[model samples]
Target: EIAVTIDDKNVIASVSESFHGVAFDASLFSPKGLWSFVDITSPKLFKLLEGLSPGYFRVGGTFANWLFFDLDENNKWKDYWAFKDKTPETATITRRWLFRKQNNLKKETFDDLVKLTKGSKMRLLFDLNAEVRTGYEIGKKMTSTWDSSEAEKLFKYCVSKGYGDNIDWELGNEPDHTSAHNLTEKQVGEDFKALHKVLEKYPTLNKGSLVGPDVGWMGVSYVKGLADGAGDHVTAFTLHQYYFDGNTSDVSTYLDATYFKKLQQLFDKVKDVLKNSPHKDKPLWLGETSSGYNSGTKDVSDRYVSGFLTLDKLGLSAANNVKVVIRQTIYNGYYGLLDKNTLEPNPDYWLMHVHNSLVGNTVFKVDVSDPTNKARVYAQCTKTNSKHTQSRYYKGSLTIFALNVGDEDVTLKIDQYSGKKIYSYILTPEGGQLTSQKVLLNGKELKLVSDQLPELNADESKTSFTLSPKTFGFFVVSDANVEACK
Candidate 1:
């Protein structure tokens, strides 16, 4: 007899208003495609994004460091690009910098992205090129300073288009991996400080958040450097996380419980660094992440099975008191929520959609009674605060969500939650195959019926019932009456 317990009365942590955000590779921002970038005019695409809006659309990746806000398209057949490291203190090449042979972001391409962000009813977090610098020729020979001239041009252009408030800013992609540029973390911080100076000059962008040095994976030295050099100029610190090496790991590894434990250690180190500094007041951000790295595993990362890692991250991140999570690649590579070419929503998309629709910013604590450690659970207040009526769950209700990873079904016991009804949205794969690309909402395939999202109707129950094996669910109680919700 296995059961899950909930302490509905206690609220442990909370996330930001737009917690579930999606990102796109910066390389696709131009007409030159990651295959092809998102079509701004498609009704189906607009409708899909509209339903998932009121969140965020982060526009960045490794390519972000190479991108320029505006300049003449002067690639002239130099469209070929590669990443490499240069020798420092060399007689010929005195300093090191990574060269990314990408064309400048044309005026129209920049406009389309902002418009699409606005069209999706989501805000944008744009990453600027921090690697750009001014060369000074001395006997010391060509020392460089972070060039804010291009960044200033971007802010000026954004204000002219009346898009200043719609976007926040990050300095670069991953400084920890800037091993290619061989940039010292303090040097990166100085670049961010320069960006900060430009930001305050624009009245329209003044109130917007200035987040970053966006480290690859909670690198302590980088976080420390930014905290000290960039200091209070950075509103929030960021780190990216990934579970398994997508190219190397098998599907079986994605479903396991133990692999998920490593993120807390990553989380802790960043916190320890911040705690050591007086910057403890600054919020920590999981700026970009997914189950795998470097485009992710072909079959395993894109399939229905990936949600266990995705959902667990949502639970694990919030439980650990992290502030925000920006899921990587909304539309590119194997890990995209939408299939790369078709633009159709994958299983992870539906799961994330369900999460954004049902869960709120306020997270509550949940305790499991199972000793096998097969039950993973998290709870939050229903999103009654949203315009979306929260599926008619009361304002003070509880949305307890979890996974049942055991070999057999288990029951959930209501402890302090004395609700009158249990509305469960049990999502399982069609044909009982975890590799299947489609997902079922309470037993029916959640297909997009010609741009209209399927009604996620829940199954109702008066008593706690069996939680099926190897599936996950969101159990909403409309009458838990938690004070934390209020």
Candidate 2:
């Protein structure tokens, strides 16, 4: 028996609305991307977004800072070309640094995106462009400042178009990396303050909070300076995390337990930074993350192996009191939760669905007697038990999820609920391919038919459950009836 104990009274942080969010690259609005060819009004895409309802939908990326919004519909390519030509060399250099394409988004397309998100019950977290052409260029260096004039124009137009109340605001993308343009952490904080002032001017925007200084990596003092400088104007501190070196097909590297340790280290650093700042108790958000960076690996990132990291990330982040974790993409490129072409749900999508549906807001502490690098255990109060009136479980029942990354089955023994009935749901790789994009629930392949979640095949048990190697399982103690959970 692998003895385990759960403390229900030990409450962590309440899950935020953006806890299971996803992002959209501003580049997708370009001519060659989804906006140009794909129908934005497709019911299938809306259905997928609806499945993750009440989630935070972020429309931003590296291009977010450079994106020019075509609000009046009169800003043509000719105007952009003129603007680009007159812009200082330093301002436009990095614009073409990654790609030569002009970063512009049309207001009509953004209107459709807003409508889609609103219909799907998703909140929009819009990342506004912070970089403006200041026309001050030095030799090998460009002088620029945080100017939210364009963003303010967009926000005012969005208010006129009725989307202002439906969105939150983020000042820029990773401003720390834009040092060549004089965009530092301190500048980011100052920019956030300036944007906050602009947001405060509009009644609709004032209702929404300003989230800012979305840093790419963990730089303790840098984030602290941002928090200290921005003070209480910022609602949350946003950071990004990517495990692998953006270019690797080695799927097994994601299974390493050391990754969790690294995440904990990151959480600690952010927390320490926040503790020393004015916004000491402010929420920390994993603004953007995925299995891999650089658009992700072709096969591995789109496969089942990525689900382990996804699940582990959610569990570990929630356990450590992180308010929100916005996944990199829902459907774009290889790292998307759904296929870009077919829009079919990937392994990580199903896993995220299971997590969002099962886990409750309140987290409980779990103590594993025999800890191993091969296994991870997380426990939370079940959210759906309240609706299970016909079942033996109550509203406050405990759900414990165990992940086994080793090659041998491990038995999870519960000392507190030995005689009580327990329900189990096991997920394994379909076709025995660890890297396959398919998942089997309780030995049956899971499928989304007519946009409905597949009925999870759960087996009833007591005291102990054996978790198979390289598998994930959820064990529920139906009658724990803990008072704190109630």
Candidate 3:
């Protein structure tokens, strides 16, 4: 049996309302000429996105830094997924694979993004074209001063459309990794300052956030550089996290506690970096992340096991005061919460949805006595107050979530939460298939019906229950009525 106790005396940290965010990759714009931008018109897209809404809808990725806004009378990507991403048919170029020709981001696409963000009631974080067009390639590194002309164009259009205050902006993706483009961290910081100057021209745009360098991992060079130069110009710090190599990752990659612990180590290192920087006081964001990089591991990254990464990262981020954790590429790639082809929910999507539905802004100090250490636990005030909460939790409610990887079942004995009516939501693989695209919520398949999401079901219970092997779940105690939450 595992003993878990949550301290209700105080709330340790308060997290962002948009802690659960999703990024739309610019790489999908012209990949192999398939041009797979998310379909805004699909009922499934709107409904599913709304399920995870009131969070961020980031419009940026690696290709976003390279993407330039321009006029295209006919938008080629509106229905680009008409051809299968990977059919058994002939393959001169697949729809999913990246082979960029560096085409323009259509104005219609930008218009659609604003509509989607507003429609979903989520904030937008649009990435500006950071690369100076020295030539073209995905890695088309900078050669001269940071280009603000195109950014100014985009900003003017945004202001013209009354979307200036509707969006947040990031200048680059993984600034440290762009040494190939010829700029150092110092230059990157300068570019951020230039972006700041450009932003200042429009008051509405300036009212929105200006976060960047967006250092890849916790690399201190950009943080230190931005602190030295662009520190005062920006609002907060952002970091991109990728734990495993998609090329080499396997099922065990999602199973081990060692893999999950690295986030703590990385956080510590970043904090150490922040301690020496002027921007230390600003909010830290896991701007972009997922289970693995390079579009993630094909099978494992999309399945039940990867939910461990999703849940664990959410747990750790809120506890450590990370304002937001943006899951990368919500529409495409192997790690997407939705299926690339069908726009259906994946296993990790359900995990994220449940977390958003239950966990709240205020975090609690959770203490667990698990001898085996396989049950990683985190607790927070129930997000019952949030508009996105599917379960209308009580004001003083508590949410205790955990991932159990032990070989056997572990009985969790809650000290104060035992007697209350607990709404329990457990996610497990159907038919014991860890890599299955589908997920079962409380033993029922989570499927889409008529563009409507299946109800997020929870088992009502009191007392205690044993978490079976290789499972993760959320326990909601709505009646405890802690003072901190009140």
Give all TM-scores, in the order shown. Answer: 0.90, 0.90, 0.89
lDDT of each: 0.74, 0.71, 0.75
User: Which lDDT tens digits does candidate 2 get at residues 210-286?
Assistant: 77667755445556766867767877877788877647647777677667666777777777767756677787788
lDDT of 2: 0.71
* Superposed Cα deviation of residue 275, candidate 1 (Å): 2.1
Which candidate leads in TM-score?
1
Native-referenced Cα lDDT, model 3: 0.75
Please identify model 2 stretches exceeding 4 Å from their true place.
Answer: 31-39, 71-101, 133-135, 140-143, 218-222, 385-393, 461-463
2 versus 3: better TM-score goes to = 2
Query: Each model's number of backbone clashes?
Result: 0, 0, 1
Error of 3 at 372 (Å): 4.7
Q: Return the TM-score for candidate 1, rounded to 2 decimals.
A: 0.90
- Per-residue lDDT tens digits for candidate 3, residues 326-407, read 9986868788888877888888887887787788889988888965568888888888754445446768888888888777
Q: After superposition, how far is residue 474 of candidate 1 from its true place, in Å?
A: 0.2
Better of 1 and 2 by TM-score: 1
| lDDT per residue (tens digit) for residues 280-364 in model 1 | 6577788889888878888877788888889989988888777788888787777888876667889998898888778888886
Q: Model 3 compared with the native: what TM-score? A: 0.89
lDDT winner between 2 and 3, please give it. 3
Worst 10 residues of 1 by lDDT: 76-85
